Amino acid sequence: MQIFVKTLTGKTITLEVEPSDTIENVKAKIQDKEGIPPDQQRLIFAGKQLEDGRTLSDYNIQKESTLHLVLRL
Amino acid sequence: IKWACEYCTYENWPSAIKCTMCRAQRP
Ligand SMILES: [Zn+2]
Numbered sequence: 093m094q095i096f097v098k099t100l101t102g103k104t105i106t107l108e109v110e111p112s113d114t115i116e117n118v119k120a121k122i123q124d125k126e127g128i129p130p131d132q133q134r135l136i137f138a139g140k141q142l143e144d145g146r147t148l149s150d151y152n153i154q155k156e157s158t159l160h161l162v163l164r165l
Numbered sequence: 166i167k168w169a170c171e172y173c174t175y176e177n178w179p180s181a182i183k184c185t186m187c188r189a190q191r192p
Binding site (some may be wrong): 113116119120144145150 | 178180183185
C-alpha cells in the first residue's frame, strides 16, 4: 500500500509499505529516503507513539494514512 | 525474542515476517 509521513519542517514523505511491516521497518524506509537513522525517528499516529515491534496492521494504519515524524524524542 | 536473519544476520522483531535490512523472508 501507500502511506505518508509528515515531517516537522512541513515536508511530506510518501512510503510504499505493506501492512505486515513493523514500525521499525517503516523507520528503515524513512532512512532510505530522508537519511535520518531509526534511533532518532519517533512516529506518531492518532496522537500516540508507535512501537517499533508492532505492525501497521496492529495499529489499524491503512492505505493513504498519514504518520508524523519527530526526531530525538 | 528477536530472530537473526540467515543472510545478513540482522536481528528482527517477532512480529516481522521479513528482514528489515535485506527483506529476505523469515524461516
Ligand atoms: Zn537480513
